[PDB]
Amino acid sequence: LSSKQHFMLSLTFILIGLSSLNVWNTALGLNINFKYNTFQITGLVCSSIVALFVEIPKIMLPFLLGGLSILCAGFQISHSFFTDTQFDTYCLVAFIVIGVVAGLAQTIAFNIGSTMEDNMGGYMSAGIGISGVFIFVINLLLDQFVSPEKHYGVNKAKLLALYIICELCLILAIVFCVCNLDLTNATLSYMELFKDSYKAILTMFLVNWLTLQLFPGVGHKKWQESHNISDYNVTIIVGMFQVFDFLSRYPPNLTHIKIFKNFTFSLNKLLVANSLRLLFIPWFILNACVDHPFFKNIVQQCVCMAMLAFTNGWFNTVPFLVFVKELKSKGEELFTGVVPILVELDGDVNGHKFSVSGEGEGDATYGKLTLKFICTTGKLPVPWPTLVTTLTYGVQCFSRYPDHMKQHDFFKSAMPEGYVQERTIFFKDDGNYKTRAEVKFEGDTLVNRIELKGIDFKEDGNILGHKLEYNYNSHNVYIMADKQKNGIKANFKIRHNIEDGSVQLADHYQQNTPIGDGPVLLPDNHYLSTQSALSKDPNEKRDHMVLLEFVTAAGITKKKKEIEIISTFLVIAMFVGLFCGIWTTYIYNLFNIVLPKP
Ligand SMILES: Cc1oc(-c2ccccc2)nc1C(=O)NCCN1CCCCCC1=O
């Protein structure tokens, strides 16, 4: 699969989005009356549900685009040829049919994406914003070279220029998307799905019951009718809305960057904090009614519109990225990012006392460990590979588990609670180690405090003689559970290469028990396959080494329609909210918001 066709299909999909949103973008930028907007919204929201619930044929893309082209081409001729009286009827009919056609085209275009391997939805998300910014830039550039003749309350050159631009864009898109994207060719109840997760539908409805209530009608129509703003300024408020509506959609998508770590948080908190947006309502009434001079500046209106635009595109795409995470064990969320690790060891072997400090990072998603270990007491009388079992295998929380087995581990849930691990290490023909360690969150850093006692070690043995080679290998740690202590048991024998070619066996019996009072996930028999790499950093002088660890669990060898149904429910809810958030503005007609004529 070459990338040339990848880029070509990406460009085709972007062009589809461009020509789909160009009509609305150019119909909002010339302060057209409210009735045409409400008719267009009604058509767009009435066609889409019917198109969604029933599988329509997938062959009507070029015909729909051609119909849109001829409908838009009709406007320029009709506006001059027709007298305004019958021109109104043509406007309303064209707007209704344009709404229906655009809804049908967008719905049929979205469905064809999921069938292909790559995700297409991001491409429509990009294309809509690109259309908005492109129309705004074109309008701003054209504003400085058009005579304001004001034939029927609308500009003359602006209409022709914008509509021929739209026609050229649509014809390019249709001629570019035809030679691609070929078009040849147990059950469960639904109510429990609806009542299981309703925390997203309410937010996705209430965040669009307001934005489309305000910006169409009360956004700048009332302000223009009150303060009589110059025509040269109305083209800037809508642009300041469009640009930020486009730009405030990407930051929630990416989070691995350090600065954007606090954007996608939760739903209950989102629902209880969404009431901060309701403060916007008195602001528009206040700046439309009060005549005091501090409010008669373009800057504050632009700031308010920019704030509304930024808050619209950030409380609208969040639910699409959170519900899957919270569908459902507790404790895995603390494994999503890279977690720092601090290790402190105080050991005593055959009367030799020592302290070791180590720092590093762990990545549970990759299941990899990187660590630097240094001796704070100087040089160590015993080899550090012998303490590797103390250092790294004393922390198994960062091990990568397969998604099938991910719920099995207790390490995932215990680490927020903290746990205590004991280990008995037997060296063949030598002494033994007894190690007690605790691993638990200090601040935002996982810490491991370990005390080691070494006994019965011969002075001429492989350990005290420093006969161990500088290398480490791959092994398997066998883990079973113990119900009596509500903990886990583990056995593993580590082989150590000797400089003379021989092999030293070190048996390790390990018992892990949780520290906190919360319940744990008691597993069955399984093993962890681990690979260790030792390296020396030449830039430091003290006794130090770098340890890299690759851990993977093993031992033991549908329902996507629920996610599909949830996504469809969210989309339907958002469309219903958008429809219901237009007529509500007529309620404002009761109060005499408009300023007196003088
Ligand atoms: C993201 C998305 O997904 C879907 C979809 C999902 C599943 C099935 C079928 C369709 N539609 C959209 C979408 O176009 N939103 C913006 C729409 N409008 C109305 C047009 C211009 C302004 C008002 C507005 O903001």
Kindly give the number of the ligand 1 atom that is closest to the alpha carbon of 24.
21
What is the distance in A from the centroid of ligand 1 to the CA of 76?
27
Would you give the DSSP letter of residue 26?
Answer: H
> Which of 110, 205, 253 maximizes ligand 1 atoms within 8 Å of its Cβ, making it the mutation to test the pocket?
110
Q: Are 275 and 166 in contact (CB under 8 A)?
A: no
User: Residue 21 C-alpha to ligand 1 middle, in angstroms?
Assistant: 10
Of 391, 413, 397, 398, nearest to 342 by C-alpha is: 391
Q: Which residue, 484, 491, 475, 479, is CA-closest to 523?
A: 479
Does 249 appear as a known binding residue? yes
List of long-range contacts for 119-127, beta carbons under 8 Å, 24+ apart: 120/13, 123/10, 123/13, 123/14, 123/17, 124/13, 124/16, 124/17, 125/249, 125/317, 126/14, 126/17, 127/13, 127/14, 127/15, 127/16, 127/17, 127/18, 127/20, 127/21
Contacts 24+ apart (CB under 8 A), 112-121: 112/58, 112/181, 113/13, 118/6, 120/13
**Domain residue spans of the chain:** 1-185, 194-327+559-598, 332-554
**Protein residue whose Cα sits closest to atom 1 of ligand 1:** 125
Bridge partners of residue 535, in order along the sequence: 546
Helix axis angle, 84-115 to 121-143, nearest 10°: 150
What is the maximal distance between C-alpha atoms in the chain? 110
Which residues does residue 491 pair with via DSSP β-bridges, in sequence order?
Answer: 478, 509
Residue-by-residue DSSP string for 419-453: EEEEEEEEETTS-EEEEEEEEEEETTEEEEEEEEE
Query: What residues form DSSP beta bridges with 450?
Result: 345, 437
Strand ranges, E, within 64-188: none
- 567 CA: nearest ligand 1 atom: 7
Method used for this model?
cryo-EM
- Which residue has its alpha carbon closest to ligand 1 atom 16? 128
Nearest residue to 27 via CA among 158, 115, 124: 158
To the question of domain 1-185 being in CATH 1.20.1250.20, the answer is yes
Structural tokens at position 301: 């209106």
Residue owning the nearest CA to atom 10 of ligand 1: 107
Report the alpha-carbon distance of residue 169 to residue 69 in Å, rounded.
Answer: 10
Q: Cα–chain-centroid distance for residue 544?
A: 39
- 169 CA to centre of ligand 1 in angstroms: 20
For residues 405 and 374, the answer to whether their CB atoms sit within 8 Å is: no
Buried b (16+ CB within 10 A) or exposed e, 528-559: bebebebeeeeeeeeebbebbbbbebebeeee
d(CA 365, CA 333): 11
CATH code 3.30.160.150 for 332-554: no
Asked whether the beta carbons of 422 and 394 are under 8 A apart, the reply is: no
456 burial level (CB within 10 Å; 0-12, 13-18, 19+): exposed
**Around 493, how many Cα atoms within 13 Å sit in the side-chain half-sphere?**
6
Resolution in A: 4.0
Q: Which atom of ligand 1 is found nearest the CA of 44?
A: 19
Alpha carbon of 45 to ligand 1 centroid (Å): 10
d(CA 299, CA 72): 35
State in Å: Cα 129 to ligand 1 middle: 12
Whether 1-185 and 332-554 share one fold: the answer is no
Residue 285 burial (CB < 10 Å; 0-12/13-18/19+)? middle
Q: What are residue 475's DSSP bridge partners?
A: 530
Q: Give residues with Cβ within 8 angstroms of 597, minimum separation 6.
A: none
Q: Shortest CA distance to 158 belongs to which of 150, 146, 171, 170?
A: 146
Distance 300 CA to ligand 1 centre (A): 30
- The span from the first CA to the last CA of the chain, in angstroms, equals 69
Q: Are 428 and 506 in contact (CB under 8 A)?
A: yes
Per the annotation, does 106 bind a ligand?
A: yes
* Residue 173 Cα to ligand 1 middle (Å): 19
Residue 430, both tokens: 């030598």
* 365, two tokens: 């998603």
Element (H, E) at 463: none
Nearest CA-CA partner of 134 in 15, 220, 221, 230: 15
Is 245 annotated as a binding-site member?
yes
For residue 212, the ligand 1 atom closest to its alpha carbon is 23
- Both tokens of 259, joined, read 């600065």
Q: How many CB atoms lie within 10 A of CB 459?
A: 8
Q: What CA–CA distance (Å, rounded) separates 520 from 515?
A: 10
For residue 568, the ligand 1 atom closest to its alpha carbon is 7
What is d(CA 382, CA 257) in angstroms, rounded to the nearest whole number? 41
Tokens at 232, concatenated: 């040269």
Atom of ligand 1 nearest to the CA of 107: 9
- Mutation test of ligand 1: which of 22, 28, 128, 308 has the most ligand atoms closer than 8 Å to its C-beta? 128
Which residues lie with the beta carbon below 6 Å from any ligand 1 atom?
21, 24, 44, 52, 106-107, 110, 125, 571
Taking the CA atoms of residue 158, residue 164, residue 166 and residue 168 in that order, the dihedral angle to the nearest 10 degrees is -150
Identity of the amino acid at 198: Y
Give the pair of three-digit tokens for residue 243. Answer: 């640009």
Helix (H) or strand (E) segment spanning residue 546: strand 544-554
> Residue 335: is it exposed, middle or buried by C-beta count within 10 angstroms (0-12/13-18/19+)?
buried
d(CA 414, CA 516): 8
- At position 342, the amino acid (one-letter code) is L
Q: Which uninterrupted H or E stretch holds 555?
A: none
Q: Find the 88 Cα to ligand 1 centroid distance in Å.
A: 28
